[PDB]
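Hi W.,

Here's what went into the run:
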Amino acid sequence: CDDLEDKPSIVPESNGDVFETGTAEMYILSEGLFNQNNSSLARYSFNRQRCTNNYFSANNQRGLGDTANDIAIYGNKIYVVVNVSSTVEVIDFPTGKSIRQISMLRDNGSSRQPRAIAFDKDKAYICSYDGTVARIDTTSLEIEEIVTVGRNAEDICVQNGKLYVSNSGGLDYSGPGVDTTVSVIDITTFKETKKIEVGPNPGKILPGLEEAVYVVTRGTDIEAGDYHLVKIDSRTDAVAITYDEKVLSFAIDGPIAYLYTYDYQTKDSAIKVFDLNAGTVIRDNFITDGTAIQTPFSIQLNPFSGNIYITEAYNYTVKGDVLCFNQQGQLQYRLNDIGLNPNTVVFSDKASQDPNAPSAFANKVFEYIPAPGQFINTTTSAYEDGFSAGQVLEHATEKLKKKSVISLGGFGGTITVGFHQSIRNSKGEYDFRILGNASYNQNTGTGALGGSAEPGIVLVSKDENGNGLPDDEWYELAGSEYGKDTETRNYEITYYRPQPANGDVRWTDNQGGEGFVYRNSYHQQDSYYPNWIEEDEITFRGTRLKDNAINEGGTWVGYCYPWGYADNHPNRSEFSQFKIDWAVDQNGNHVELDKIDFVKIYTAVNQNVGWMGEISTEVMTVEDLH
Amino acid sequence: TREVRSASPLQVFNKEELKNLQALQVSDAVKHFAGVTVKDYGGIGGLKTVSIRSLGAQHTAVSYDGITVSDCQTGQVDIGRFSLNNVDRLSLNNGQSDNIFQPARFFASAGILNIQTLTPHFKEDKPTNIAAEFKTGSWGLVNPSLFLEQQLNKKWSMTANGEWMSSDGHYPFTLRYGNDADVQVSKEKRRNTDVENLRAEISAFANLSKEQWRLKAYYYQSSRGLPNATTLYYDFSRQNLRDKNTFIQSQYKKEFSRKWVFQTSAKWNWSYQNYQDPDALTSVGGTDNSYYQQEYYLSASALYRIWNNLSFSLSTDGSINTMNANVSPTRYSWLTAFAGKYVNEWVTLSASALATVINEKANAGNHRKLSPNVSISLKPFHNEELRFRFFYKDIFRLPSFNDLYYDKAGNINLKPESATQYNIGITYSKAINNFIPYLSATVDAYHNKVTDKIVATPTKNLFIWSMVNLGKVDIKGIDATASLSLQPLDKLRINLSGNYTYQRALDVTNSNPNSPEGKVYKHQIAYTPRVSASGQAGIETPWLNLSYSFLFSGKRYMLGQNISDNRLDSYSDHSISAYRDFKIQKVTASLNLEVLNLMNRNYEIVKNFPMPGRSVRVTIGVRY
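Here's what came out:
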């Protein structure tokens, strides 16, 4: 009588909406346990919405190995460095089948125990606990050259055409102590050029912007909590700045880095946001929605959606989680029981297994003039350095094509979008939907599915003349706040370019109000004012809504209005859709239109919040239901 | 006979049953004790520790000829260290171990495994007994043995045992690259299992005047290779482990006339453990950890009988356990046990009590815990030998020296666990007719509670495993066993035996789902088969003896999570053997042919440590 059966996982796989901008596949490498070789490589396909926990074993009919340490996607291949098995699985990207088996072995049969991989000019450079860095060609997949970098190595990175390898010396803790060195390797001659005295036990190492290398150094004792973060200037290969904040690992975008610390005595874990230029912490807790964190195993950053992926390992015995957070720290989703100790999350956009097609997801932006804000003059504002306004427009069309989020800045900043075909009028139900990056908090002060609401007024117009140009008459949609005392019609605001480039941006209105939109340390571009604007003063005209953000401390909640506004609600689960029948004219009379072509979105709320800046309407991608 | 009258749950294998249980290094015969969950490694010469009733594997105490041996470094004791060439009687006690005349270290352990050494008989004339038991086969296994016995002064006898056990042990195991069914598979050979055991023993039995002054001098040098786990795509290990265990043991017994029996035990044990890993990536070129252990053990147990049927025991102990390495701990321990109202009454209560207290002075804990034990063997129905048994026992683990003084991975503030056991059982035996000379069946439903369990949890950095008191395992299993010998016609004994265990060992450490160990609540613990069972069949014919023994273990899991991804499949280990004795001018030759793992099943009991397949073992023995 064997009543012993595999009891299920009980909790569902995904505990949130699984949406991501421009990411096709997302691969999660899970270590498993030492001497138990139950490592795995899971994937999530956002296009097919398909979750595969045992993807490598489902493909090649063989397990990945023991303690798979690193994963990286390069040149339509996935390179998986597996430590105890001492292998590098170099599996093909569109098929998922393993193409070649690289043996990371020494002259004898002893394992090199490789840990991490870095890429520079179609060579994969792999560091090991043997103290060696190996160069592997991406074509023949053979070990071409071995260099000795001294003691045991843990992570490797590429910057300024040089490999930085963190010589940890971890296994020598009972003997001569941990090593204190980061080795620098040139591409051209491929010898060890310099050895940087960095601090004891250097671990995770990553390049950043402004041509620098950030490395985490542990203590002589790991449990002692003597962690530091070292900025190394790649010009001189010397220790530039030593930050005393406790780090286990970190993920870098722009000038900021999301880093977690994890003590081993009290088991206390914290995830902070850090400014790599100012050198100070900004938020002592990254998770600002009340989502409990217990054991963050590693932290990654999506290179082309901006989200932060923190994996959970718990007691290092049960299957971990993968939690996706936004830039503000609200949880987007989490994959539950994705694998045993999920180590490293990598991302791709090329998928596995057309602009001329309509595809029900709009075609091209016609007008884009945003107000100054925290997201302006960055990659999410369709701007790069030294490009004119038409270049900003065609980058906006390109970002709309790749389903990337576009921001509108402060109050009054507007965007105008069309479609491949005219949307027919559906009577009695909704016509089109606007996708937003708003996420809901599980508990707020009030109800109505609160969270981060950034409401915006939508307008629609019909291409009656048929020229494809936004010169037709604009009709405002009557929302839930329309016609009440909670809205301020005929509001004219103007923004002034500050005389310092990096200054707070001044705005004045016709209602007697004067104020600023403030600089925050997250977004440190040249100016919050739009750089492709040639005039000093810009003005915007429209209806101002009542401010919906309420100070509860550092936990500001944008309370959602019921219906009729863009980026007011999360993009699924009702009240984010729109119909033509809400459109009214200037005089407020109801106008019935048989078809519709032009959708205009501008920000309805003029409010500063603080560390999340102004209320900014972010448009993901408009889409019709027909 | 025994195994029925015992108040605590006793199982016993005599010399002919251990003959029928074809095995070497003891732990392959331990697997048939009907409650034992063995944690094992690779094949010959692997680490083979024992859990009594799916308790901790450090809650057991194995006793080599009247004194328990105590491994302090990783206190899971190597059972495969002891060999089966000189074992007269093997026995497992789940409790008080029947009689209260033991040294105090036998008490306060949740189960003891008693290995008894061959006591020589010395039949009339014949001063000298010579025995050799040369065993060979199974991929380079060789095992010569010597058993020089000599009577000295009609009360002194001397037994010198020698055993060289060189081995190769390359098993043709079958490696699966995964856990599901559609997995590519490989036929790989096991590497680095070179075992080179050597055992020497000089035991002196002094039957003075009743009075015994049994002594033993034991030496054990080994050079076993320690194989790694079968990691995928990589099997090259060079780990060597040298053991140099030795001890000198003394056992004095005196019967000071009526109402007084006195006993002294003494033991000096020196152990050496050299672990070499030349493939390790330490910058000096490999780890060379050496551990030195010493145990000074003394006991002055006494027994005083109030009447002919009732007895008390006062057992005082003493132990100095020193350790050196490459910090350098020393544990002073003092046990004294007062056995309570032990009655040995005819058709009424056979109740017994025992309170043992312990005192350790170590920079560590200084515990003075009291441990009770009650064992009742109430027996109605005088016409048949049917016993009702019930024993409550609260024992506790001590934290090992690897759990306290390993290089800053082990905690220093470990709470020393618990083991709370409430076994209740029915034991029946009959000798009806002559078609069945002996029948017996014994069913014990037991409830073991472990609290504050010391567990090694990984940390996924340097000094990987760390000790923590995170475990509250509740065991509620039931263990049945049977021994049925039937004799058809004449001289054709068809001696059968069997055992079964419905082990329900659920981890109940934290009931809330919002916890890392809340997914482990009401879940089976890691290496514990639910429906573990065993069986034996001895066929005694005068021209050829045959024996069969099979092991069944159910769906063993991994890590306590209980998902199908970390499932281990149920296995069956079937084995057969043949025995023959020849009388050649008063010299007894013995030929033995053993086939182990008869169905060639490549199974694992601990993950990525595959057990050997079909092996053939040939034994040639010369007696006198």
